[PDB]
């Protein structure tokens, strides 16, 4: 068909929430139980 040449040119379905950087859940829960 037409080409817009006039404008120059993990197998996964990854998610945004996966890119967050935070401590391991084990560490988080350990700290929570420790302080409560």
């Amino acid at each position: 068909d037409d080409e817009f040449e006039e404008f120059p040119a993990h197998v996964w379905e990854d998610n945004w929430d996966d890119d967050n950087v935070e401590d391991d859940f084990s560490n988080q829960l350990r700290a929570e139980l420790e302080k409560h």
């Binding site: 197998v11 996964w12 998610n15 945004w16 929430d17 996966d18 391991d24 859940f25 084990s26 988080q28 829960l29 350990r30 929570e32 139980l33 302080k35 409560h36």
Partner: protein, 379 residues
């Protein structure tokens, strides 16, 4: 089938290639024991290159010479078979050679030899065995392209004629690959279909396979299917008697005991970070299981106070507030927080409202397709 290569080798190597676990020397002793036993000079060289290890020339030379002599004698036997024996034994000679290349760790040579053996051989069973060796090499080296190509080859062979035993072994291979590529739904299906007849002891012992089935089933199956096929599974309960922690995890989720559930999920996260096949899935799996626990708790409530949620999950109130806010913002929970007077309202959609929204979405998709087709054709 034989352990070739022992995927325990890859497990040890990966588990070693991790911070805070390098040079514990137990992993190193195990891996060196196996490498010396099977005379893996090339894999040893690759490991030294990867991990920047003090190469022991004294033993490396011995392994090299043993491997060279083995290769030469195998090749001489193969040539003798060509000169005297017929195809029926020439195939066995090539097959044994390729097996030895896999044992030592000559990846490309082993693949070439197996391709030649596959081309030569006509027996359907031996073709399946070759394809399964290729699939095991693919799993060992985590080359997704080879793994998928040989999975398709195995499926094509089974359609062209196969048997129940190879069908189950292929099912276990497919489930392992799905777990590798984060397809926990299909992994759950395959693992539960092959749980009662696990024969592939070359990949992992029945206990490890059952732990994988439990984990994948918990993350992929709804509550009814989970109760019907895991909590009421004879062959899973039989092994969970031996495994007391996996049982506590699964039953803490099922019996709505959530503090114990988070404890078990933390230990599962650690175990499954250490694991080699699930390693690039521990964050996602923990997140999804936390979302499942939150949705399960809120499934039977119209307004749940944050204090009660925190006490139920054995955490603080800030922790639950932060997690709930994150997942609601991401769109994974049907609940709205209310912090001035801490309460978690439950805005689940009615059946008719959900039906209307689904109709809007599907109709929008279909109407876009119809519009595109009409504009393509009317001109």
């Amino acid at each position: 089938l034989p352990k070739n290569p022992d995927l325990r080798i890859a497990q040890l190597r990966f588990l070693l290639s991790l911070p805070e676990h390098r040079g514990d020397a137990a992993v190193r002793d195990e891996l060196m024991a196996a490498v010396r036993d099977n005379n893996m000079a090339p894999y040893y060289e690759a490991l030294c290159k990867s991990l920047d290890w003090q190469i022991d020339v004294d033993l490396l030379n011995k392994m090299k010479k043993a491997n060279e002599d083995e290769l030469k004698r195998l090749d001489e036997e193969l040539e003798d078979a060509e000169k005297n024996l017929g195809e029926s034994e020439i195939r066995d000679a090539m097959m044994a050679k390729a097996e030895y290349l896999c044992r030592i760790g000559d990846k490309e040579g082993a693949l070439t030899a197996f391709r030649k053996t596959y081309d030569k051989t006509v027996a359907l069973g031996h073709r399946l065995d070759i394809v399964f060796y290729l699939l095991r090499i693919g799993l060992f080296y985590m080359d997704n392209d080879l793994i998928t190509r040989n999975t398709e080859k195995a499926k094509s062979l089974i359609e062209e004629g196969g048997d129940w035993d190879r069908r189950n072994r292929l099912k276990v291979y497919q489930g392992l690959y799905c777990v590798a590529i984060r397809d926990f739904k299909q992994a759950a299906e395959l693992f539960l279909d092959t749980v009662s007849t696990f024969t592939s002891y070359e990949l992992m012992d029945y206990k490890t396979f059952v732990t994988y089935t439990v984990y994948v089933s918990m993350i992929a199956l709804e509550r009814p299917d989970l109760r019907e096929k895991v909590i009421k599974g004879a062959e899973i309960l039989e092994v969970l008697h031996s495994l007391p922690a996996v049982r506590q995890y699964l039953f803490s989720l099922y019996e709505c005991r959530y503090s114990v559930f988070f404890q078990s999920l933390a230990v599962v996260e650690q175990e499954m970070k250490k694991d080699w096949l699930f390693a690039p899935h521990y964050r996602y799996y923990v997140r999804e299981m936390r979302i499942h626990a939150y949705s399960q708790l809120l499934e039977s409530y119209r307004s749940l106070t944050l204090g009660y949620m925190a006490e139920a999950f054995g955490v603080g109130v800030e922790f639950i507030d932060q997690e709930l806010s994150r997942f609601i913002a991401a769109g994974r929970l049907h609940c709205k927080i209310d912090k001035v007077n801490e309460i978690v309202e439950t805005n689940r959609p009615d059946s008719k409202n959900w039906q209307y929204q689904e109709t809007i979405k599907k109709g929008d998709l279909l109407l876009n397709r119809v519009q595109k087709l009409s504009r393509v054709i009317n001109m």
